[PDB]
C-alpha cells in the first residue's frame, strides 16, 4: 500500500530508491562545516532531496588540519548521485582534476534557489578542469542567477538556452572567461547532430537537452524502428516505445499503435477476444469460478467450447468432449 | 465499413453509477468484439471492458468487480457501478472485426465524456 508520512507519500512502491530529504552544508549535522567534506559526506547516503545548499570549496579536497578532517575522496563523490533536488543552491568552486564532469549530479533535476549565494547566484561552477558540465538531468533554475566562470577548457556551456530552465523574471546568466568559443568547435567539441537547437551537457547522444528526432531510452536516435528492426515500436511523446511480443513483425508497415498485446495489427499465434495471445486459455478462472476452456479453429482464433465440455475440447459442439 | 453510435455519459458524484450503451451497424462479422477504451488526462487510452460475441468478457483490473458488460446482438450496455475520481475519462465504443488471426480491423466511436465530481 502507499500512504503519505511528514510531507511524503512513501512506502515500498518506489522506483529505485525511497525519498529522503537531507539538511544542506551549515545547518543541523552540517552545521560549522564550511563545505562537504571527508567526515560529513557519509550523512549524504541515500538522500534524494537537499533543504539548504550545498557548498564543494577547495578546502574539502585538500583537508584541514585546525578541524582534523582528511581530504576527500574523489570517488566517494558519487555518494551525491541519488540526490534530485536541492532547495537552496548549488556552488562549486572544486572538484577532482581526474575527473572530466560533473558526473556526480547527473541525476540532479531542480534547483530551487530559496536562498542565493551572495544575493543573488542558486548554480556557480567557477574554476574547474571540467570540460563538460554534464548537468543531463537538470530542467529547472526556480529562483537564482546562474554563474559558470573561469574552468579554462569547459566547453558546451554556451549551447544551453538557460531561459527555457528558469522560473522567474529578472533571472540573468553569466558565462564569462571558460574556454573559446572558436576553440571549442575548432576541436570537435560541440553538441550532437542529434541534439536539438536547445544546447547539450556535453558530446554524447544522451547528454542533449532534447532531441532533434526520438529518443530510445534515455539516449537519443535518428528513427524509431517503425517499419524495420529486430525490437521494433512505436512513437509515444517523442519515446519509442518496444511493441508487445506476441504480434507478428508486419513487414513495410508500422506493426503496432499502443503498448498492449490488443492494438497491435496482426497476431503471431492466436487470438482470444482483443488480445493476441500464445496460448487458447485452458484453466483461466473468474469468479462464480469455472473453468473456461478454449479451441482454436483452422483460422487460429481461439472460441470457448460448450459449458459442460470442462475437461479440454479440441472441437466445437459436444464432439470435442 | 463500419459505424457506432454511442449513448450514455454524463457526470456524476463519486459512488455514483451510469450506463454506457454503443450499437454498431455496417459489414459486421461473425465473430468480433465489442466495447469499451478510456483515455483519462493525460494518459494512454487503456481497454476498459470488451464482450465477444462468444460472451467472454475482458475488463481492466482498475474496474472489475464495478464494470459489468453486456451485448444483446450487436449492440453493448455497460453498467459503471462505484465510479471513482480515477474513472473520469472520455470512453470510446470500439469493435473488432475479426476474420482470421492475420486478419481483423478495428473502428472507434466519436467519444463520450464520462466525469465523476463533487
Known amino acids: 500500500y502507499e500512504m503519505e508520512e511528514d510531507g511524503v507519500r512513501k512506502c515500498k512502491k518506489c522506483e529505485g530508491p525511497c525519498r529522503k530529504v537531507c539538511n544542506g552544508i551549515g545547518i543541523g549535522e552540517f552545521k560549522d562545516s564550511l563545505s562537504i567534506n571527508a567526515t560529513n559526506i557519509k550523512h549524504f547516503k541515500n538522500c534524494t532531496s537537499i533543504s539548504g545548499d550545498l557548498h564543494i570549496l577547495p578546502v574539502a579536497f585538500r583537508g584541514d588540519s585546525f578541524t582534523h578532517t582528511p581530504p576527500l575522496d574523489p570517488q566517494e563523490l558519487d555518494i551525491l548521485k541519488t540526490v534530485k533536488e536541492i532547495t537552496g543552491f548549488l556552488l562549486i568552486q572544486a572538484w577532482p582534476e581526474n575527473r572530466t564532469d560533473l558526473h556526480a549530479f547527473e541525476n540532479l533535476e531542480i534547483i530551487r534557489g530559496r536562498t542565493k549565494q551572495h544575493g543573488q547566484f542558486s548554480l556557480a561552477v567557477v574554476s574547474l578542469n571540467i570540460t563538460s558540465l554534464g548537468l543531463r538531468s537538470l530542467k529547472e533554475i526556480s529562483d537564482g542567477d546562474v554563474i559558470i566562470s573561469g574552468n579554462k577548457n569547459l566547453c558546451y556551456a554556451n549551447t544551453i538556452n538557460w531561459k527555457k530552465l528558469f522560473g522567474t523574471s529578472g533571472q540573468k546568466t553569466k558565462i564569462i572567461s571558460n574556454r573559446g568559443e572558436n576553440s571549442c568547435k575548432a576541436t570537435g567539441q560541440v553538441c550532437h547532430a542529434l541534439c536539438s537547437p536547445e544546447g547539450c551537457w556535453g558530446p554524447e547522444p544522451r547528454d542533449c537537452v532534447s532531441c532533434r528526432n526520438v529518443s530510445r531510452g534515455r539516449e537519443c536516435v535518428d528513427k524509431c524502428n517503425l517499419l524495420e528492426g529486430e525490437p521494433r515500436e512505436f512513437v509515444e511523446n517523442s519515446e519509442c516505445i518496444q511493441c508487445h511480443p506476441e504480434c507478428l513483425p508486419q513487414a513495410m508497415n508500422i506493426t503496432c499503435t499502443g503498448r498492449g498485446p490488443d492494438n497491435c495489427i496482426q497476431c503471431a499465434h492466436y487470438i482470444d477476444g482483443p488480445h493476441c495471445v500464445k496460448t487458447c486459455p485452458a484453466g483461466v478462472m473468474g469468479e462464480n469460478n469455472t473453468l473456461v476452456w478454449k479451441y482454436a479453429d483452422a483460422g487460429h482464433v481461439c472460441h470457448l467450447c460448450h459449458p459442460n465440455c470442462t475437461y479440454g475440447c479440441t472441437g466445437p459442439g459436444l464432439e470435442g468432449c | 465499413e463500419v459505424q457506432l453510435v454511442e449513448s450514455g455519459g454524463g457526470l456524476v458524484q463519486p459512488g455514483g453509477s451510469l450506463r454506457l450503451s454503443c450499437t454498431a451497424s455496417?459489414?459486421?462479422?461473425?465473430?468480433?468484439?465489442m466495447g469499451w477504451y478510456r483515455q483519462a488526462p493525460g494518459n494512454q487510452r487503456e481497454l476498459a471492458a470488451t464482450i465477444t460475441t462468444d460472451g467472454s468478457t475482458n475488463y481492466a483490473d482498475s474496474v472489475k468487480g464495478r464494470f459489468t458488460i453486456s451485448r444483446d446482438k450487436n449492440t453493448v450496455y455497460l453498467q459503471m457501478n462505484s465510479l471513482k475520481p480515477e474513472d473520469t475519462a472520455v470512453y470510446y465504443c470500439?469493435?473488432?472485426?475479426?476474420?482470421?488471426?492475420?486478419?481483423?480491423?478495428?473502428?472507434w466511436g466519436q467519444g463520450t465524456q464520462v466525469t465523476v465530481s463533487s
Open positions: 455496417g459489414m459486421i462479422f461473425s465473430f468480433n468484439v
Open positions: 470500439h469493435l473488432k472485426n475479426i476474420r482470421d488471426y492475420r486478419n481483423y480491423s478495428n473502428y
